[PDB]
Amino acid sequence: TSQVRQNYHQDSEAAINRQINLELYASYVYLSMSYYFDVALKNFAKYFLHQSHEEREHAEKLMKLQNQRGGRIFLQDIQKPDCDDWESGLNAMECALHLEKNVNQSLLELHKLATDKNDPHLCDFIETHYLNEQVKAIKELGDHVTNLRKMGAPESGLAEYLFDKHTLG
Amino acid sequence: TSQVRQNYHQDSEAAINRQINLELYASYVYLSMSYYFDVALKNFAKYFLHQSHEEREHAEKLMKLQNQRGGRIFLQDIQKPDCDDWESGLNAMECALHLEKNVNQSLLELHKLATDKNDPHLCDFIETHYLNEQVKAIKELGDHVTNLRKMGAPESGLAEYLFDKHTLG
Amino acid sequence: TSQVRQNYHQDSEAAINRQINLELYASYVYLSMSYYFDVALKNFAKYFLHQSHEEREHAEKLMKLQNQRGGRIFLQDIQKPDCDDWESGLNAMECALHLEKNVNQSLLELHKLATDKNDPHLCDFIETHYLNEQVKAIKELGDHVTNLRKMGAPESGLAEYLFDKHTLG
Amino acid sequence: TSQVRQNYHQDSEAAINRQINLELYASYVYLSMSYYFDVALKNFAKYFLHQSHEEREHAEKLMKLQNQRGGRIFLQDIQKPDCDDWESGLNAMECALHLEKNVNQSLLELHKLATDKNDPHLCDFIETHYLNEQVKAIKELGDHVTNLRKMGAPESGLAEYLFDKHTLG
Amino acid sequence: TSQVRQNYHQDSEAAINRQINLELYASYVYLSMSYYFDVALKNFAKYFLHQSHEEREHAEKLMKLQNQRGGRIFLQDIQKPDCDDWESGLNAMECALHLEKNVNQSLLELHKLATDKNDPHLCDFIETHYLNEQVKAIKELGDHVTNLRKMGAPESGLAEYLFDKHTLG
Amino acid sequence: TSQVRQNYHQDSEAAINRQINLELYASYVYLSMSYYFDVALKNFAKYFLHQSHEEREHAEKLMKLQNQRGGRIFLQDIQKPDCDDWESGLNAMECALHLEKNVNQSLLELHKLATDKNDPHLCDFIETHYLNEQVKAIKELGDHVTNLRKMGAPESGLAEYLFDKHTLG
Numbered sequence A, B, C, D, E, F: 001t002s003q004v005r006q007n008y009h010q011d012s013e014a015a016i017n018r019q020i021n022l023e024l025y026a027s028y029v030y031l032s033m034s035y036y037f038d039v040a041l042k043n044f045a046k047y048f049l050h051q052s053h054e055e056r057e058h059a060e061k062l063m064k065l066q067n068q069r070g071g072r073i074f075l076q077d078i079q080k081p082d083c084d085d086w087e088s089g090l091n092a093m094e095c096a097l098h099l100e101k102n103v104n105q106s107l108l109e110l111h112k113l114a115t116d117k118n119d120p121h122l123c124d125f126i127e128t129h130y131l132n133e134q135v136k137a138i139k140e141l142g143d144h145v146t147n148l149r150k151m152g153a154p155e156s157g158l159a160e161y162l163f164d165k166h167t168l169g
């Protein structure tokens, strides 16, 4: 019986909890990728490690909004990364691109729900903190995927090495 | 077929992977506790949030050793926190004490395995980075549990509030 | 009924208490030596006074570990220095050498006990804080004893005076 | 056959040696108290640890006067703390108050002896370095004992905790 | 007849002397490699020259422990580098990887001997100063070997040149 | 088939390689002496350790000239120190004096060869970097040998100790 809860639909509360789990999952995927490239693509490793920290801040801010609006946080298992054993740095970038577009669709479904329930604070929260960061991340990974393919990856040995030094350096 | 792997038993590699999952689980438990105390015990929240960051560094360093020794990281689901809905800040401290002693026993089993396989580098790694941090953490949580009980928790309203301001401030 | 005690054998607890008393005794021996050389070897006095402070920190850290592991500190009488009335600064160095090698054997017995009880944290604690400091101290006192004998002590009047100014200055 | 000894009675020399042992004993009592309060009253611990260092400086200065006046230092066993297992921080303060008043009576007996032997330098030494420090220490411990009783110790759980934070912080 | 020697087996003393010669040999191998790459891979040259200085510090610290524990240093011929005339920078990295893993096995045999003779100070010395440095060095050379092969070495003319500028720059 | 080699006789190339081995041998002799005086003449130890570093720079610069002139470096075993077990610091100085004069004769034979082959660059290199350093080193060791004998070494216990503090301090 929250004395602070106001105009916060239970469907929105449940969907925020599902988004929290998805952000944590994305953090887990990036942590997997980071530690995977320990041998020869160590700037890929630090790119994905930074991506991993960002995803956990994404989850923590949704956990904070759940408390702010008077909801109840409900956590679930953080599934281990679906994609794994990437044969190259390019394949990891492709999976991250796929991941971020899946997360973007989740955020767009969240916004549509907030719109349907007439929750302008929740729509503003999604737009201010997550919608443009998603567009930027998808654009960045799209740039990386396309550039690496043009450079000659994944066949070329120098392509991923040089991309590691110059683009992710 | 690792060219760097040397004196690294597959039982040790598997046990390191299980320890990685346990450290991540401990990080998840502390993140749950941190966000739980958003109302009235906000220094409990920052204590547990700091504990959460420490557990993830614990996991990342074990992931780094897995690569260093020529092993293969194998990740599993991060189970959601077993304990939940703590009725007070003291109960969260009791569960963290229980958690850390369970983690300590895991680390002691790890060391016994490393001793049995005559892996002095792995024994040194466990002793240098994890065994004393565990003793310190168990001692700290033990101090917090005992102090809060003496102060009159969990019945006393002022006890947890003042402990929040003075001990965890 | 310690809630923090874990893998801490009562034999180890008792042996830590005996080591505490031995470290305090060593501090008492050095304090005796320091105040003994007030007349003509005042840099011997400050060497032994510094040695005395170090031994008390040795005891305080063992007292801290006793609490950390959930043991109970049990103090005993600090026996007055066995050796006394040293006829020269060299004889005091010989007794300190004898003392430190006796303390080293105690620490090696402590480690063997910790090894027998499979207490890797206690083995690490002894190795990290006390085993190399003991080797260094025995080497230093051995150097001082040998050097003073070569210089012509204890018969030579200038030998101990110059050693006081140059080696311990 | 001291060429520096002048107007220094052998009764005074023996009584200085007994005072040295008493100061060391007081240092041992405070060290015991300091390490005793490791759990919940850690500012009591640092108060008593500081008291312990002060008592050892008290002993070292009496050892220095013994040499200054041409006497011979004679050390004895440092008895382990009589009082122990204090049920609260207040009980430790009561024992320290009892201890300091016993030490004060010793210092007053010392002064009466110095007066009887017409040793104005020894009377000045006792008055300058020890008589007012004793009055201050007895007053301080008396204040702490009375304040803690008024606050509701030892029954009140908050009393000793808050006194630890505010008075001894 | 060392007055400082304590719990130091003659087998350990002899094995330390053999390790000293091996560390000096490793320093000689790296000095050979450094001066070998004077033409076109001058950052390989400075990588191996730095490796060479490190190996001599490795030897000097073992010589210091031999004195510390009361042993006697016995030096032998420093054999000229076995491997030589490396056809590429990659082949030099492969020989250094082979060398470091041979040195690691020597250090692990040393530790097993120290364990058998119950010398915890010598086990700590090996673990603290040499076991993790060996794991790091083997991992680094393993990374370099694998990366250079992927880049296209040794056939590719640009591969070793760019690796020289970016990885070893 | 060196495109840079010009006016560089193969006899000079071979003699440079022999000089390289001799400089490394001299470095090994000084390293032996340094670690030998760990007990009572620790400024002798640092004098010889500095001498040892200088000899290795002597060897590295000859290795660099071998590459500069288009020659091929050929390394041989670094023989363990001929002289050993010096009974005093003076005897170590006498052996170093003997060593440096043997090295000087080698450098003078090298110069005569360079003169016979009309290699003015090699004559300049020997004169600029090695001939005066040799005269200075022989003069210094000659001074040390003579001074220590006059002071009363090796019989006098104070002589080597004071020389250690004042001349080599």
Ligand SMILES: [Ca+2]
Residues within 6 Å of the ligand: A123, A124, A127, A128
């Ligand atoms: Ca908006």
Ligand SMILES: [Ca+2]
Residues within 6 Å of the ligand: B123, B124, B127, B128, E124, E127, E128
């Ligand atoms: Ca270790």
Ligand SMILES: [Ca+2]
Residues within 6 Å of the ligand: B124, B127, B128, C123, C124, C127, C128
């Ligand atoms: Ca250790």
Ligand SMILES: [Ca+2]
Residues within 6 Å of the ligand: D123, D124, D127, D128
């Ligand atoms: Ca006065």
Ligand SMILES: [Ca+2]
Residues within 6 Å of the ligand: C124, C127, C128, E123, E124, E127, E128
């Ligand atoms: Ca150790």
Ligand SMILES: [Ca+2]
Residues within 6 Å of the ligand: F123, F124, F127, F128
């Ligand atoms: Ca010239």
Ligand SMILES: [Cl-]
Residues within 6 Å of the ligand: A013, A014, A015, A017, A018, A074
């Ligand atoms: Cl939900």
Ligand SMILES: [Cl-]
Residues within 6 Å of the ligand: A024, A027, A028, A031, A056
């Ligand atoms: Cl995570």
Ligand SMILES: [Cl-]
Residues within 6 Å of the ligand: B013, B014, B015, B017, B018, B074
């Ligand atoms: Cl596994």
Ligand SMILES: [Cl-]
Residues within 6 Å of the ligand: B024, B027, B028, B031, B056
């Ligand atoms: Cl996490």
Ligand SMILES: [Cl-]
Residues within 6 Å of the ligand: C013, C014, C015, C017, C018, C074
């Ligand atoms: Cl006991």
Ligand SMILES: [Cl-]
Residues within 6 Å of the ligand: C024, C027, C028, C031, C056
């Ligand atoms: Cl003491």
Ligand SMILES: [Cl-]
Residues within 6 Å of the ligand: D013, D014, D015, D017, D018, D074
């Ligand atoms: Cl007396």
Ligand SMILES: [Cl-]
Residues within 6 Å of the ligand: D024, D027, D028, D031, D056
């Ligand atoms: Cl004390």
Ligand SMILES: [Cl-]
Residues within 6 Å of the ligand: E013, E014, E015, E017, E018, E074
């Ligand atoms: Cl040997």
Ligand SMILES: [Cl-]
Residues within 6 Å of the ligand: E024, E027, E028, E031, E056
């Ligand atoms: Cl070398």
